[PDB]
Design a protein around this ligand. Structure first.
Ligand code: NA
Ligand code: NA
Length: 327
DNA sequence: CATCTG
DNA sequence: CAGATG
């Protein structure tokens, strides 16, 4: 956790690069286990060979740890951190919409900067365009003081279109967090579930309302159960308009809300622990359900949940207010 | 994983 | 349809 930190970091830099710049998914994946393992390793890695000793740890990495241990740096790391091409690729990727794949193409075409991109808005697709449009806004965190206002709007409008809708804002916003990255809404209706054959309108109706009043301003992607957009809190009395924020809305069958709700609320660590304990108590959990574990190895069957409570209960545990869902 | 693009 | 992005 700090004993082998640099090593784990340098490896992460390397891993990252394999995958992003080169296309070395193999290698990329290589650095990953490696860091994962040295990550757990209880002692102070004093050398290559010592490391090699571990699994995932081959000769080449060993080589690497050596240099880095021997001198405060790595040539390869040093060489990559310069290389304009590599840098471009890490940068373009910042744009919502450009993945690495794209980043390569553009660079090989000479697009390497923000301006580059504007000049060539023709080559970017819609998502990518919105992305470029709101680069800044997009990178800005979201303060809860704003989140609360957003939440206020969305919930009220869903209310109006249908009294029967159930919306919940998950994320860290939910776990207490002072600021967040994007707004994430979980949505269900009574009339939609596991079996119920669809109802797209269930989602599209709400999306519209939200644009009806202008809360939503753009659509990144809109399907029948998941919507990816851009919203914005009405600029008050002109002088201070707000940054544009990423937002998602997704339809969930009422019969799998809470697990999803639970699940999205996180944090990752909370999940895991809860997941393992579930396992203990003779259970299973994933994003949509909790099932009684058979002894034959495993087994299924959907346990029936009416709130985050039914879940906890199930695995017989202390109901956890979202704030204390941390670890 | 669900959506888009081409 | 494969293959990209979030
Ligand atoms: Na991106
Ligand atoms: Na293939």
């Amino acid at each position: 956790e700090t004993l082998n930190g640099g090593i784990t970091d340098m490896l992460t830099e390397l891993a990252n690069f394999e995958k992003n710049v080169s296309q070395a998914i193999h290698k990329y994946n290589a650095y990953r286990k490696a860091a994962s393992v040295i990550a757990k390793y209880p002692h102070k890695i004093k050398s290559g060979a010592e490391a090699k000793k571990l699994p995932g740890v081959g000769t080449k990495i060993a080589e690497k740890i050596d240099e880095f241990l021997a001198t405060g740096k790595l040539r390869k790391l040093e060489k990559i951190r310069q290389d304009d091409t590599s840098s471009s690729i890490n940068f373009l990727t910042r744009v919502s919409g450009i993945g690495p794949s794209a980043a390569r193409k553009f660079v090989d075409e000479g697009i390497k900067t923000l301006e580059d991109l504007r000049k060539n808005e023709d080559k970017l697709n819609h998502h990518q365009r919105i992305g470029l449009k709101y680069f800044g806004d997009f990178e800005k965190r979201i303060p809860r003081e704003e989140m609360l206002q957003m939440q206020d709007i969305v919930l009220n409008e869903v209310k109006k279109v249908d009294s029967e809708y159930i919306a919940t804002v998950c994320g860290s916003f939910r776990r207490g967090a002072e600021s967040s990255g994007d707004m994430d809404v979980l949505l269900t209706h009574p009339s939609f579930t596991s079996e119920s054959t669809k109802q797209p309108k269930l989602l599209h109706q709400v999306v519209e309302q939200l644009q009806k009043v202008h809360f939503i301003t753009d659509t990144l992607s809109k399907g029948e159960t998941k919507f990816m957009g851009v919203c914005q809190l009405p600029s008050k009395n002109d002088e201070k308009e707000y940054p544009h924020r990423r937002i998602d809305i997704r339809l969930i069958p009422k019969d799998q809300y809470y697990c999803g709700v639970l699940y999205f609320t996180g944090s990752d660590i909370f999940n895991k622990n809860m997941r393992a304990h579930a396992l203990e108590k003779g259970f299973t959990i994933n994003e949509y359900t909790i099932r009684p574990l058979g002894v034959t190895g495993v087994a299924g069957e959907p346990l029936p949940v009416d709130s985050e409570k039914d879940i906890f209960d199930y695995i017989q545990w202390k109901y956890r207010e979202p704030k204390d869902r941390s670890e």
